[PDB]
Amino acid sequence: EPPVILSMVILSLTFLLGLPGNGLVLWVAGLKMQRTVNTIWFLHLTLADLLCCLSLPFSLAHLALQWPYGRFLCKLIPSIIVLNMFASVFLLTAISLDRCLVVFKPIWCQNHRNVGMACSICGCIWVVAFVMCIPVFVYREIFNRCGYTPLVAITITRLVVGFLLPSVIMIACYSFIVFRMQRARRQLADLEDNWETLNDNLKVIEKADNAAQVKDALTKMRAAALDAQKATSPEMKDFRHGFDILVGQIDDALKLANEGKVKEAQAAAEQLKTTRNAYIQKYLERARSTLKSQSKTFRVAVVVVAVFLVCWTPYHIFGVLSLLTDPETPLGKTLMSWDHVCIALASANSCFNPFLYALLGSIQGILEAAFS
Numbered sequence: 001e002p003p004v005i006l007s008m009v010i011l012s013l014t015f016l017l018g019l020p021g022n023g024l025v026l027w028v029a030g031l032k033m034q035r036t037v038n039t040i041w042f043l044h045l046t047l048a049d050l051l052c053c054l055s056l057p058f059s060l061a062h063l064a065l066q067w068p069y070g071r072f073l074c075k076l077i078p079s080i081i082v083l084n085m086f087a088s089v090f091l092l093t094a095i096s097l098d099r100c101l102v103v104f105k106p107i108w109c110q111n112h113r114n115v116g117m118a119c120s121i122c123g124c125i126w127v128v129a130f131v132m133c134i135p136v137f138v139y140r141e142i143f144n145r146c147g148y149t150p151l152v153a154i155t156i157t158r159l160v161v162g163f164l165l166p167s168v169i170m171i172a173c174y175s176f177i178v179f180r181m182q183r184a185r186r187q188l189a190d191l192e193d194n195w196e197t198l199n200d201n202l203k204v205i206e207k208a209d210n211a212a213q214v215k216d217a218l219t220k221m222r223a224a225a226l227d228a229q230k231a232t233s234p235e236m237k238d239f240r241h242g243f244d245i246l247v248g249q250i251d252d253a254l255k256l257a258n259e260g261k262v263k264e265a266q267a268a269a270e271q272l273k274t275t276r277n278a279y280i281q282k283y284l285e286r287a288r289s290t291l292k293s294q295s296k297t298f299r300v301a302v303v304v305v306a307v308f309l310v311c312w313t314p315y316h317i318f319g320v321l322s323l324l325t326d327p328e329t330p331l332g333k334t335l336m337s338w339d340h341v342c343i344a345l346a347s348a349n350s351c352f353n354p355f356l357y358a359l360l361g362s363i364q365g366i367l368e369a370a371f372s
Ligand SMILES: Cc1cc(C(c2ccc(Cl)cc2)c2ccc(Cl)cc2)sc1C(=O)N[C@@H](CCCN=C(N)N)C(=O)O
Pocket: 007, 008, 011, 058, 059, 060, 062, 063, 067, 073, 074, 077, 078, 081, 082, 136, 146, 315, 316, 318, 319, 320, 322, 339, 340, 341, 342, 343, 344
């Protein structure tokens, strides 16, 4: 019975902390940035969460007075929460799919990457959510007990569609993304190692006397340069041409040192710095910058997805347990009591969502950086 008071305080806290931040995010993202295929999805998700939190007061009013005013509210208010759940799940799986498909072939990257396509797909998402929602409105009546055979079927259908299939799709997509991301790292690591050995060999060769250490350092440099050139477009051709020039200069230095000349070998070795800086530095800088960008986004998506699933799982666990377990048992007496807190958490998810955007990213300077 105290759990009922826990439910009402949870609902009240969500209502008080959900309207301001969500409306703030909606306004900031709506009237500051410029329409792109990426931020429209987060705008739709925030709008759905705001619509969910806008119908909270009535649930609290019902829960405070055990509704002696109209049958319409008992049939409408439970529908909005389910519509919120369906729209949020579908938008999250669309976001995941798009993020995993960006790194695919350019066929889908250049095909129809336009804002109109995003608007149309969001329209289809909302339509499907509404069609899936209508059953809940239809199968609900006042006996003032507000509850529901079709019960055994509706719960299974909802569990299958809104929680099982999209979960598998997102898990597979993010597993593929992380497996592909862990691969690029090794290649960058190897290229950095080759650059490092080239660098310190070129450093030692300057201070090295006699023609034997010069040949040894040049041999190590040549091996490193060949290995780096093997690692892998106009920039690609440019990269390979730069390494070909570098290997040519290394050969010139080696042939000069073979004939027992030191100072000329030193000058030939010093000559490689200009070509190195003019050719490979820009590619190295791009390869560093062309990495963090992805992380600042993959983590932002993964945290949102995981938090959503964690907040919504008790709802379906308790739904299944109420479906299988028979009533008229002392278990049901507390099962009904705990159903309220489960639903309260499932509805409270909307307060958790808008804080992660600020935590993981001026109001604009943070929100716009998060929505990238
Ligand atoms: C979201 C929601 C909210 C509901 C309650 C309610 C709100 C706040 C709190 Cl703290 C406690 C109760 C409510 C009361 C009066 C009014 Cl006017 C509106 C809502 S019922 C309900 C819901 O969707 N039920 C599902 C399946 C039910 C069984 N599922 C289990 N067991 N997991 C459905 O009907 O299809």
